């Protein structure tokens, strides 16, 4: 018989922690990672590639796989940390599109002010609430239990019966809908100012603020008001437990006209690289990390730096005067 | 046992001046059969029941040769000389009856698994005689090797002296040689790498240049592992040119030098030929 048998878990926060760290690790020049993103392979996977249902071959990782990916590479683009943001899935009160706009489950996080139907309050950016408590009547995820409280006493999920009457409101620390009456209670987080909403937010994913960037303005994020008791905090992402970072990048034909030219079959596959070094005429010369935003693959040293992530797609065709955008996210 | 014909050779006066196919149609018959003996010699003749020695499963040549395994029904017939056989008598004791041979005719046989016992003996008839063997020799030895050689054929008389050997074991001598006892009157001889044997037995003979003084002793040694020593027992001492009943004509000393058991043979007499010969050894391996 097994003598010792033990149990241990990592908190979801540690996901976040890695991220926040990982966010720290992109450097400017020195001793912190620098990131280039690359596309290539005009060459067709196979004649099918155009047709529907075609799945390009699953990429290969090897010094061989590297070389090949490194071989075809059309172009390269750097990444500034400010294009990297933490994000959580956006969910708006009252939104028809998505299921149960009016039915919220405990700890769900609800955005307000996002949309006209959503919007309670004018002259304010988007709001972010989390829903602490849900109506008592409902159904339990564990089929054995018909009581919310009993469902939760065991800890199984609970879905409430009664829909929300109104989207949550108030800066107020507790303050969902407590006095007059409702089944839901709502927790407030911070408010999002519109420009960032507009520029950052994807209707699936709100963009979540950095603790650092927060240190600058607690107000612009509406966080200044509260109560922390740890003093300054700003570690808000811990509270929301965002595990997801959004890479944003912008491709333009101009840096790489050659792959942009009419008749290019476009690039099949994508690759990101970290801390590559410049090309050098003399191999004894000291290595140089790459400042400029784009490099033709030539101007980069062969194989310098490490590429973490490789990708293969059906061909995508860049075109001149087009401006194409790439987003890649990460859950650590 | 696949039967072989002797060598059968092609006519070259045929071919380009005669009917090509026919003369060749014949030649293959030779060639095919010709290699058969070859591969049947150095490979299992039971591979003929296979693709007839053809294919990758076909008979292969063994630079060591192959000892042909068969039923007893086949050895129930006088078996020709020159053949290598492997039969295991675990099933039963067998007679291997052999044709009347010729002077120089050999018969090689083995039991590889050593199933041969008294319960699994092996009888042999080589026609008209086997030297030293009245009637048919029986073989009860496991892992033995049956080698007959016909030392007389003459007219009717096939005389087979007989050799047999354990198919395995340690048969080597670590040290055998001869030298002359130095002007220094001694030397040191590496015998074996000190680890090779727990026991050895050797025979040294120290003989004068003119051969009149010749020294002999019976050398039994115990290699001492932990102490890196070798313990000796000498007895049955014999001499010829001995001038003294004490140590005479030479002396025998031992040591382990340079990871070698090293005998130091010292003779007060100069010009003493000493032949160092290790007749038997022993080492311990694993249990079982």
């Amino acid at each position: 018989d097994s003598s010792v048998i033990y149990r241990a878990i990592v908190t979801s926060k540690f996901r976040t922690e890695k991220m926040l760290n990982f966010y720290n690790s992109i450097g400017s020049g020195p001793d912190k990672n620098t990131i280039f993103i690359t596309f290539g392979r005009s060459e067709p996977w196979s004649s099918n590639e155009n047709e529907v249902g075609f799945a390009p071959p699953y990429p290969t990782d090897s010094v061989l796989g590297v070389t090949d990916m490194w071989t075809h590479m059309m172009g390269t683009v750097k990444v500034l940390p400010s294009m990297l943001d933490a994000v959580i899935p956006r969910r708006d009160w009252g939104d028809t599109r998505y299921p149960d706009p009016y039915t919220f489950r405990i700890n769900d996080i609800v955005v307000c002010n996002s949309a006209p139907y959503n919007a309670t309050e004018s002259g304010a950016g988007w709001l972010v609430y989390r829903c602490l408590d849900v109506p008592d009547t409902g159904m339990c995820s564990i089929a054995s239990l018909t009581d919310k409280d009993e469902c939760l006493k065991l800890g199984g999920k609970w879905t409430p019966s009664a829909r929300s009457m109104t989207p949550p409101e108030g800066r107020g620390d507790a303050e969902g809908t407590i006095e007059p009456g409702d089944g839901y209670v709502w927790e407030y987080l911070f408010e999002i100012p519109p420009d960032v909403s507009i520029n950052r937010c994807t209707n699936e994913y709100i963009v979540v603020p950095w603790p650092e960037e927060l240190k600058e303005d607690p107000t612009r994020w509406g966080y200044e008001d509260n109560l922390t008791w740890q003093q300054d905090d700003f570690g808000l992402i811990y509270r929301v437990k965002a595990n997801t970072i959004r890479f944003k990048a912008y491709l333009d034909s101009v840096y790489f006209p050659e792959a942009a030219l009419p008749g290019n079959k476009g690039f099949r596959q994508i690759s990101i690289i970290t801390n590559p070094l410049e090309a050098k005429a003399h191999p004894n010369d000291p290595n140089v990390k790459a400042e400029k935003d784009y490099y033709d693959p030539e101007d980069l040293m062969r194989h310098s730096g490490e590429m973490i992530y490789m990708e293969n797609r059906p061909p995508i065709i860049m075109a001149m005067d087009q401006t194409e955008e790439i987003n890649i996210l990460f859950t650590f | 046992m696949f039967i072989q014909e002797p060598k059968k050779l092609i006519d070259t006066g045929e071919i380009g001046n005669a009917s090509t196919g026919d003369i060749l149609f014949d030649g293959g018959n030779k060639i095919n059969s010709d290699f058969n003996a070859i591969y049947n010699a150095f490979g299992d003749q039971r591979k003929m029941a296979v693709a007839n020695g053809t294919g990758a499963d076909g008979q292969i040549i063994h630079a060591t040769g192959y000892y042909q395994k068969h039923s007893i029904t086949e050895y129930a017939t006088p078996v020709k000389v020159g053949t290598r056989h492997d039969i295991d008598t675990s099933t039963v004791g067998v007679k291997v009856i052999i044709e009347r041979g010729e002077l120089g005719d050999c018969v090689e046989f083995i039991n590889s698994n050593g199933s041969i016992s008294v319960t699994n003996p092996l009888t042999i008839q080589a026609i008209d005689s086997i030297k030293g063997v009245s009637g048919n020799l029986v073989v009860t030895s496991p892992y033995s090797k049956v080698t007959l050689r016909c030392i007389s054929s003459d007219n009717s008389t096939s005389v087979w002296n007989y050799s047999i050997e354990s198919m395995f074991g340690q048969k080597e001598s670590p040290a055998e040689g001869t030298w002359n006892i130095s002007t220094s009157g001694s030397v040191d001889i590496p015998l074996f790498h000190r680890t090779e044997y727990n026991m050895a037995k050797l025979l040294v003979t120290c003989q004068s240049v003119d051969g009149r003084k010749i020294k002999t002793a019976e050398i039994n040694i115990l290699v001492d592992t932990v102490n890196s020593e070798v313990i000796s027992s000498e007895y049955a001492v014999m001499r010829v040119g001995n001038e003294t009943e004490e140590d005479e004509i030479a002396n025998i000393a031992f040591s382990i030098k340079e990871n070698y058991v090293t005998a130091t043979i010292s003779s007060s007499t100069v010009g003493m030929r000493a032949a160092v010969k290790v007749i038997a050894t022993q080492k311990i391996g694993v249990a079982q």
């Binding site: 196979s46 099918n48 590639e49 799945a55 390009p56 | -």
Partner: protein, 147 residues
């Protein structure tokens, strides 16, 4: 580290007994595929080794499809394919609804029109499929014109 995913559309396109043309969907590029055959019945009963049945492989393959002519007419056989390429976890070993290749099936085909074949030829050569009857490529053929 992850599976060569699978073929999706996987089928035996035609049955001429002891022969199959199997169609699996091509899925990803430069993925060879691991085509198996397994045995429903022992001919004693059916699916007697429902599980525990033997497997035999046709090897990895190229393209999206493989043509297969072997074994017995009328008999039920499992076949299984697994996609693969160099650096992957292995595929799922996908199964068919299988089949049995019926009885006698043979060729239905064109030739140069004027020619008139002798039934017994194909009658043996194809309906019974035996190549020994005439192993054509090798064999020698008298060609006799006629009164």
């Amino acid at each position: 580290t992850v599976k060569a995913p699978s073929v999706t559309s996987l089928r035996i396109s035609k049955l001429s007994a002891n022969q199959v043309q199997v169609r699996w969907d091509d899925v990803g590029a430069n993925f060879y595929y691991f085509v198996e055959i397994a045995e429903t019945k022992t001919n004693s009963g059916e699916n007697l080794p429902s599980n525990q049945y033997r497997w035999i492989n046709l090897g990895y393959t190229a393209n999206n499809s493989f043509f297969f002519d072997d074994a017995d007419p009328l008999t039920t056989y499992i076949i299984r394919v697994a996609t693969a390429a160099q650096d992957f976890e292995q595929s799922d070993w996908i199964y068919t609804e299988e089949f049995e290749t019926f009885a006698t099936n043979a060729y239905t085909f064109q030739n140069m029109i004027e020619m008139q074949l002798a039934n017994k030829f194909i009658q043996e050569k194809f309906t019974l499929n035996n190549s020994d009857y005439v192993n054509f490529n090798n064999d020698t053929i008298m060609a006799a014109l006629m009164n």
